[PDB]
């Protein structure tokens, strides 16, 4: 082994962390994603574009669950995503072992944010390059949070991430409003993913995971197939 | 531009221990003379201001009851070496019921003189060599012995050595006035004669301190008001 143990994320003379902005620029060149929390549950949508028809779409997944009621999608680099998914799963299992209650989504967001912060600060390692989007229906009210590679977190009613996200943000501010239902939230999420997608939009391309008060459910290709028609 | 602490020179000697050799002559001078009836030491205090109390500055620090020392360089670095030498002398007395030879305590204090490391372990090991040269004088079992230690860890026996800023001038003035058959009062007078022209200030009974180790007298005497007996002769 070597054991560097020196932090290579230092302050710029202008007064900022340059590596955090570089990781955010890495996030901004990632896959597009959208997340909408509308009055009964949270809907997360993204884009799976393969470079060839020889890939297997159902092998890897992007709407990866954590518990029976918490879901996660991402925008950024794929290899730096399974690691924090596994860490969040292990941390939620530790919480369930200690307190004997399903983990509220907010505490999961703070602890994965603290994990990202200590990866930024500690020695010899680069920061993460993935922005998260964590959804869940705990204690009645749905919750939708986003954590950036800086290690912070916010809370959004409806947000977008990845490539071409400022126009998606204006779309979510204009077309959507405070009160929707679940199904028309799925409709407008499919529309705002279709504002930057390819010519075709099938269930092999888009992947949508919804949440509600009956638990987190990743949609089958059949449900996205009949949802994508005439929408 | 910047290299590690263990780096050899292109001509081959070293790149940090020679810098510790270069830091020797930024300190005060110190003269030790070995004679067949005793070992005499002398040093320059190098006062700066009249407000500073002159008795606080010490260079002659005793290690064992029969062994003296004299410094040249950075006193705070050599405090650790002198404390370690005290620990080794007491440990050898405790484990063998006899006093250390001055060669053995010089070897014990020179073993750890070159032990700096960056890849090394422990609770903060030395990261730079000590920048001091030490003179040791004693009467162990073969009689009067004087030793000199430099930051490369090399220790040798010297009959009459002077270290510090004007080490080469005091050595070249020590060449002519020395012989094997002399006495202690003559040695003190000759060392004070050498130290007369070396110092940039005027000599009195407060700018220097000297110490003599003999087979008869256990520790070293000649504090203040005993220096005035030989100062007025000079």
């Amino acid at each position: 082994e070597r054991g560097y143990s020196f932090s290579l994320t230092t302050f710029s003379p202008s007064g900022k962390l340059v590596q955090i902005e570089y990781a955010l620029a890495a996030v901004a060149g990632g896959a597009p994603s959208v997340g909408i929390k509308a009055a009964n549950g949270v809907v997360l949508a993204t884009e799976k574009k393969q470079k060839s028809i020889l890939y297997d779409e159902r092998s890897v997944h992007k709407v990866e669950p954590i518990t029976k009621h918490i879901g996660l999608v991402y925008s950024g680099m794929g290899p730096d995503y399974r690691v924090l998914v596994h860490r969040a799963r292990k941390l939620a299992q530790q919480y369930y072992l200690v307190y004997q209650e399903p983990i509220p989504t907010a505490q999961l967001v703070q602890r994965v944010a603290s994990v990202m912060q200590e990866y930024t600060q500690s020695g010899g390692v680069r920061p993460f390059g993935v922005s998260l989007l964590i959804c869940g229906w705990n204690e009645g009210r749905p919750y939708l949070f986003q954590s950036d590679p800086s290690g912070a977190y916010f809370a959004w009613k409806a947000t977008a991430m990845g490539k071409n996200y400022v126009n998606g943000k204006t779309f979510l501010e204009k077309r959507y409003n405070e009160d929707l239902e679940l199904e028309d939230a799925i409709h407008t999420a499919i529309l705002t993913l279709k504002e930057s997608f390819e010519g075709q939009m099938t269930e092999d391309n888009i992947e949508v995971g919804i949440c509600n008060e009956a638990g987190f459910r990743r949609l089958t290709p059949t449900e996205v197939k009949d949802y994508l028609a005439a929408i | 531009y910047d290299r590690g602490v263990n780096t050899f020179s292109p001509e081959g000697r070293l790149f940090q221990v020679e810098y510790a050799i270069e830091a020797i002559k930024l300190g005060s001078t110190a003269i030790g003379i070995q004679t067949s009836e005793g070992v005499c030491l002398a040093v320059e205090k190098r006062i700066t201001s009249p407000l500073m109390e002159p008795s606080s500055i010490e260079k002659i620090v005793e290690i064992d009851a029969h062994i003296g020392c004299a410094m040249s360089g950075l006193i705070a670095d050599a405090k650790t070496l002198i404390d370690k030498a005290r620990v080794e002398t007491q440990n050898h007395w405790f484990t063998y019921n006899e006093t250390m030879t001055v060669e053995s305590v010089t070897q014990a204090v020179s073993n750890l003189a070159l032990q700096f490391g960056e890849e090394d372990a422990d609770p903060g090991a030395m990261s730079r060599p000590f920048g001091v040269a030490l003179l040791f004088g004693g009467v162990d079992e073969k009689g009067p012995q004087l030793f000199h230690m430099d930051p490369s860890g090399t220790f040798v026996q010297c009959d009459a050595r002077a270290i510090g800023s004007a080490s080469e001038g005091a050595q070249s003035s020590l060449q002519e006035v020395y012989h094997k058959s002399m006495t202690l009062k003559e040695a003190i007078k000759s060392s004070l004669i050498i130290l007369k022209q070396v110092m940039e200030e005027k000599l009195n009974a407060t700018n220097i301190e000297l110490a003599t180790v003999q087979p008869g007298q256990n520790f070293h005497m000649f504090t203040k008001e005993e220096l005035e007996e030989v100062i007025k002769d000079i």
Binding site: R2, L8, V18, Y22, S52, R58, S59, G129 | -
Partner: protein, 240 residues
Amino acid sequence: SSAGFDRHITIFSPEGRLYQVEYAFKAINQGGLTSVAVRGKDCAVIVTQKKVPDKLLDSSTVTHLFKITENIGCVMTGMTADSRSQVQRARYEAANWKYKYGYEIPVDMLCKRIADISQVYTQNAEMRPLGCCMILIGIDEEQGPQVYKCDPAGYYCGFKATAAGVKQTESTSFLEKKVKKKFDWTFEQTVETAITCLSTVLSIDFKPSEIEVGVVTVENPKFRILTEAEIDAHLVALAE
């Protein structure tokens, strides 16, 4: 468009890209070999050419067709030493899974463990990112044959038929047109397509002594390495 140490250690560029994995990909096609995996209805086949430029070299220890477990096979591309280190790591992880969880480790979980191992190499800035490739084949009950490909950057994904090495682009361009008409993909069809892919990419019409073919199937799940007699039979059956 660097930032001082952008070339050397694994850090983010101002453009967002991290350059050490992109320089490590050239280690895959530096070696000069090409390997094609083709999965059909009830079989998965691996074809890799081998180079023996000197007669004194043993021809039975050149082969990159490594065996991970008795039903899970693999092939490599790139530097040979990192490939063998990944081979030993994959064998150790398969044995550890078989000791821990009681049943046989699936192919996708082994690929996930390999990708998770390789991700820490590009996460930290003190190790070389280990530029070699990974192709695994196996059979999984109620899933049929499975073929997976891992990456030095830690990106694993499923496949239907894929190739790695130096000639990936032309082989995939031919293979897309081959797979676009979904015909009867039997055993003989799969070995014929896998051989003719390299035969049309390289245009060499190779002798049977320089081609290694590994097979796994549903009729028997054991990994088999084809000897020269069956390669002789398949090559004379290919020539009409």
